Design an enzyme around this catalytic site. Structure first.
Site, PDB file in Angstrom:
ATOM      1  CE1 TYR A 183     154.466  92.241  79.080  1.00 23.35           C
ATOM      2  CE2 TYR A 183     153.122  92.629  81.016  1.00 23.35           C
ATOM      3  CZ  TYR A 183     153.620  91.760  80.061  1.00 23.35           C
ATOM      4  OH  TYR A 183     153.283  90.435  80.105  1.00 23.35           O
ATOM      5  CB  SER A 184     153.475  98.665  75.323  1.00 20.81           C
ATOM      6  OG  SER A 184     154.310  99.732  75.741  1.00 20.81           O
ATOM      7  N   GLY A 200     146.347 104.479  81.643  1.00 19.69           N
ATOM      8  CA  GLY A 200     147.312 103.382  81.851  1.00 19.69           C
ATOM      9  C   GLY A 200     148.734 103.893  81.760  1.00 19.69           C
ATOM     10  CG  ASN A 217     154.347  98.250  93.660  1.00 15.49           C
ATOM     11  OD1 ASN A 217     154.158  98.699  94.783  1.00 15.49           O
ATOM     12  ND2 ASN A 217     154.616  96.972  93.448  1.00 15.49           N
ATOM     13  CD  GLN A 218     152.333 100.253  86.272  1.00 12.54           C
ATOM     14  OE1 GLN A 218     151.168 100.543  86.016  1.00 12.54           O
ATOM     15  NE2 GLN A 218     153.120  99.652  85.395  1.00 12.54           N
ATOM     16  CD1 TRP A 231     139.186 103.231  81.148  1.00  6.61           C
ATOM     17  CD2 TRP A 231     137.198 104.251  80.922  1.00  6.61           C
ATOM     18  NE1 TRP A 231     138.281 102.292  80.735  1.00  6.61           N
ATOM     19  CE2 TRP A 231     137.053 102.886  80.590  1.00  6.61           C
ATOM     20  CE3 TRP A 231     136.077 105.092  80.861  1.00  6.61           C
ATOM     21  CZ2 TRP A 231     135.829 102.348  80.196  1.00  6.61           C
ATOM     22  CZ3 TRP A 231     134.865 104.558  80.481  1.00  6.61           C
ATOM     23  CH2 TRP A 231     134.750 103.205  80.147  1.00  6.61           C
ATOM     24  CB  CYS A 253     153.151  86.900  71.501  1.00  2.00           C
ATOM     25  SG  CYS A 253     151.631  87.114  72.444  1.00  2.00           S
TER      26      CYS A 253
HETATM   27  C1  LIG Z   1     144.485  92.129  78.137  1.00  2.00           C
HETATM   28  C2  LIG Z   1     145.553  91.858  77.082  1.00  2.00           C
HETATM   29  C3  LIG Z   1     146.683  92.727  76.982  1.00  2.00           C
HETATM   30  C4  LIG Z   1     147.663  92.498  76.003  1.00  2.00           C
HETATM   31  C5  LIG Z   1     147.528  91.403  75.118  1.00  2.00           C
HETATM   32  O1  LIG Z   1     148.578  91.153  74.077  1.00  2.00           O
HETATM   33  C6  LIG Z   1     148.394  90.110  73.101  1.00  2.00           C
HETATM   34  O2  LIG Z   1     149.162  89.970  72.205  1.00  2.00           O
HETATM   35  C7  LIG Z   1     147.224  89.193  73.218  1.00  2.00           C
HETATM   36  C8  LIG Z   1     146.249  89.389  74.280  1.00  2.00           C
HETATM   37  C9  LIG Z   1     146.400  90.555  75.229  1.00  2.00           C
HETATM   38  C10 LIG Z   1     145.420  90.802  76.215  1.00  2.00           C
END
Ligand SMILES: Cc1ccc2oc(=O)ccc2c1
Ligand SMILES: Cc1ccc2oc(=O)ccc2c1
EC number: 2.1.1.-
Length: 285
Positions: free
Chosen positions: A26-27, A65, A91-92, A116, A262
């Site tokens: 999730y990134s 994280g 779960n993680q 942390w 986004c």
């Molecule tokens: C807490 C948190 C985490 C990821 C995020 O990703 C974004 O693009 C905008 C806001 C945001 C806020």
């Protein structure tokens, strides 16, 4: 009580599975070369982070994280290091324990159900991939001081975070687009990441320097996040029926709005994603 209001926006891991790659990352992925699959690009993003950290065999890497444990496993396998992961997700935690116990190594592997704030053990290097958005502005000084203090003289840290611009900078790129972006950010930190708060790249850099870190030019991942959010959005859309069955039409629409929105504001350069490197004074050249 406000927690309950946010608790409304809790979503099962099963929903995220319907738009994410098989690693459930999730990134922001890293499409280098450009024709990697999402899944491959997620491994390339892990390598992008780890390759900056000057990791030597027998060092300890802290993952703040640690998600589903993909970064920690990759570190152990590629660099022959001990790992410690921090997550707030039960779960993680359970998944990470199992991922790390599966690895063929004598290295120490530990996953802690804590933030942390509660972690104060010596570590060599730190990685944090899109957890920083949750810490809150008031906690940045404490975060960077903790990271500086737990590392040795040659310590290095990477932080990957979504970012926005200062209101003044946002105003400079059209008033109409500035208010529109502010309202969409408010939606993200209400309905997608409740209690979240985007830093600016400048905040990430200056809080690091105040703590004593050397901060080279941050890497923008903007074009990589655009591609990631496109694939996420297209994947969720292809699984619409299954997504609704698992949650509701409300939750499907919420996440399509988030993913399409986004992608839009990243394209319009009102959002960015910064990979910031923090070097202690004694870090290797
Ligand atoms: C807490 C948190 C985490 C990821 C995020 O990703 C974004 O693009 C905008 C806001 C945001 C806020
Ligand atoms: C809970 C759960 C189940 C299967 C998974 O598959 C993966 O490869 C990574 C994350 C994951 C997490």
């Amino acid at each position: 009580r406000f927690e309950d209001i946010q608790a409304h926006y809790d979503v099962s891991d099963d929903f995220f599975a319907l738009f994410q790659d098989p690693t459930r990352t999730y990134s922001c992925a890293y499409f280098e070369p450009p024709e990697l699959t999402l899944e491959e690009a997620q491994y390339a993003k892990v390598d992008l982070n780890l390759d900056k950290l000057d990791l030597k065999p027998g060092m300890t890497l802290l993952d703040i994280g640690c998600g589903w444990g993909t970064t920690m496993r990759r570190a152990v396998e590629r660099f022959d290091v001990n790992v410690i992961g921090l997550t707030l997700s039960k779960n993680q935690h359970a998944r990470c324990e199992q991922v790390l116990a599966s690895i063929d190594t004598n290295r120490s592997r530990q996953v802690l159900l804590q933030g942390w704030e509660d972690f104060a053990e010596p570590v060599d290097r730190i990685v944090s991939i899109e957890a920083f958005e949750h810490f809150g502005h008031e906690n940045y000084d404490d975060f960077f001081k903790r990271c500086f203090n737990i590392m040795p003289a040659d310590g290095r840290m990477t932080v990957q975070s979504s970012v926005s611009y200062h209101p003044y900078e946002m105003a400079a790129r059209g008033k109409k687009l500035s208010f529109e972006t502010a309202r969409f950010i408010k939606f993200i930190v209400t309905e997608i990441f409740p209690g979240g708060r985007l830093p600016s790249t400048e905040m990430m850099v200056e809080h690091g320097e105040k703590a004593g870190f050397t901060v080279p030019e941050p890497l923008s991942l903007r074009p990589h996040y655009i591609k990631t959010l496109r694939i996420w959005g297209d994947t969720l859309q292809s699984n619409k029926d299954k997504a609704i069955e698992v949650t509701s039409e409300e939750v499907y629409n919420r996440y399509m709005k988030y993913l399409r929105g986004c992608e839009h504001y990243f394209t319009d350069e009102m959002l960015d994603c910064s990979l910031v490197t923090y070097l202690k004074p004694g870090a290797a050249a």
